[PDB]
């Protein structure tokens, strides 16, 4: 719903507050989201590179 990105999505085990959509890291990069339809938290890890 607006957050555009790339990466691997994985089942999370963090708990947002029930009005927060996505989570950010220190240095300010999106690293978790909440699925609008089912309302579950998913981590966003980058696509392997090197």
């Amino acid at each position: 719903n607006g957050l555009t990105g790339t990466g691997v999505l994985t089942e999370s085990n963090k708990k947002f507050l029930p009005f927060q959509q996505f989570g950010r890291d220190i240095a300010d990069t999106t690293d978790a989201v909440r699925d609008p339809q089912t309302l579950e938290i998913l981590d966003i890890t980058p696509c392997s590179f090197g």
Partner: protein, 265 residues
């Protein structure tokens, strides 16, 4: 700079070899960090071992000899010292020497000194009893060598108490800490500089790109490119200035290891 997008890569291709220079600059720094460590620690031909006894004239080196009941085989004081100190294109390479290897170089330097004095630093290691080596060293500071043999027990007790006080004074390392930090904080600024527009509409290369058409978007993408390239040049220039300061320090360490550990100054 670009980061995934493709409208950015063709525009950045117009700047020449600015990115090749920066990668060369950073690679030179990384190759210098292994030579720093080779010059300080790999100052010994053989890997020397202490004998299974510890009859050293009443001198007790147990807190600085390696600990056989460990995977790392560090000493007690080296264990005290080690408990006190993916992104947008960023990567950390590992050092060539593990610190098991570094601890193995240091223990061999130690066993060379305790068993042969200063002879292993000038050629083949020639054993000498530790009390007699201590008496040679008392001559080097201008004291007559019976002052050592008539006071051996007192001198050994004073050494042992002074070695005991060092752990208490340990369990300081702000220099190394300073180093470590100065680098993490400069790497955090480079990542934080990616959320700035530099005078474009936004700072995210898609929203600029899916809300304007090419002629209009290329103008903003060039501003983003200019800002992000300036940030990277600032970063690399400061890493170059900070590595020359670390090299002057490793050079002082190499001279100390030669002149204070492999000889008497």
């Amino acid at each position: 700079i670009c980061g995934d997008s493709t409208e950015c890569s063709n525009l950045l291709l117009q700047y020449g070899s600015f990115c090749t220079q920066l990668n060369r600059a950073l690679t030179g720094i990384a190759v210098e960090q292994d030579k720093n460590t080779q010059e300080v620690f790999a100052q010994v031909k053989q890997i020397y071992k202490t004998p299974p006894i510890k009859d050293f004239g009443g001198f007790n080196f147990s807190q600085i000899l390696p600990d056989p009941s460990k995977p790392s085989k560090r000493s007690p004081i080296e264990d005290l010292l080690f408990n006190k100190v993916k992104f947008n294109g960023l990567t950390v390479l590992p050092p060539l020497l593990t610190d098991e290897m570094i601890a193995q170089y240091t223990s061999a330097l130690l066993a060379g000194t305790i068993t042969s004095g200063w002879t292993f630093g000038a050629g083949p290691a020639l054993q000498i009893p530790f009390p007699m080596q201590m008496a040679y060293r008392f001559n080097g500071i201008g004291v007559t060598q019976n002052v050592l043999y008539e006071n051996q027990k007192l001198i050994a007790n004073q050494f042992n108490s002074a070695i005991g006080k060092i752990q208490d004074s340990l369990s300081a390392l702000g220099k190394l800490q300073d180093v470590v930090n100065q680098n993490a904080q400069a790497l955090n600024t480079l990542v934080k500089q990616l959320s700035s527009n530099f005078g474009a509409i936004s700072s995210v290369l898609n929203d600029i790109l899916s809300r304007l058409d090419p002629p209009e978007a290329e103008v903003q993408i060039d501003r983003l490119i200019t800002g992000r390239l300036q940030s990277l040049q600032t970063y690399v220039t400061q890493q170059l200035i900070r590595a020359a300061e670390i090299r002057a320090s490793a050079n002082l360490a190499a001279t100390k290891m030669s002149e204070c550990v492999l000889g008497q100054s």
